[PDB]
Amino acid sequence: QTVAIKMGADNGMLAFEPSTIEIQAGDTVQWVNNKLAPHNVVVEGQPELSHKDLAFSPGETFEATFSEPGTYTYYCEPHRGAGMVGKIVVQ
Ligand SMILES: [Cu+2]
C-alpha cells in the first residue's frame, strides 16, 4: 500500500505529519509538500531511499519503497535545526 506523510504540519509547525509511522515491508511512502517549503528528505544511511533535491511547490510529491524491515530515521536538511525529523518503522 502507499501511505502519505505531509512535509510541514497543518498547524504551521516545521515537522513531518505524522512524525512516526509504521508500515509493512514492501509498502511505499509518499511525502507531500504541505506548508513552509522548501523541504527535502534524507533517510539516514540510505541514499537510495532519499530525495536530496528540494521540493518548492505545494503538493509536490516523491516516494520511496521500503523493502527491508527495521526503523528508519529521516530528516529535512533545511529545517533539521528546527527539529524536522521523522521515523518510519517497517514491520
Ligand atoms: Cu523542511
UniProtKB/Swiss-Prot annotation:
MF terms in GO: copper ion binding; electron transfer activity
GO cellular component: plasma membrane-derived thylakoid membrane
Domain Plastocyanin-like residues, every copy: 1-91
UniProt subcellular location: Cellular thylakoid membrane
Keyword Cell inner membrane included in the entry's annotation: no
Residues reported to bind Cu cation: H39, C76, H79, M84
Essential cofactor(s): Cu(2+)
Keywords carried by this UniProt record: Copper, Electron transport, Membrane, Metal-binding, Signal, Thylakoid, Transport
Cystine residue pairs: none
Details of cofactor binding: The crystal structure with reduced Cu(1+) has also been determined.
Membrane topology, record value: Peripheral membrane protein
Protein family membership: Belongs to the plastocyanin family.
Role description: Participates in electron transfer between P700 and the cytochrome b6-f complex in photosystem I.
Entry protein name: Plastocyanin
Residue numbers of the full-length protein present here: 35 to 125 of 125
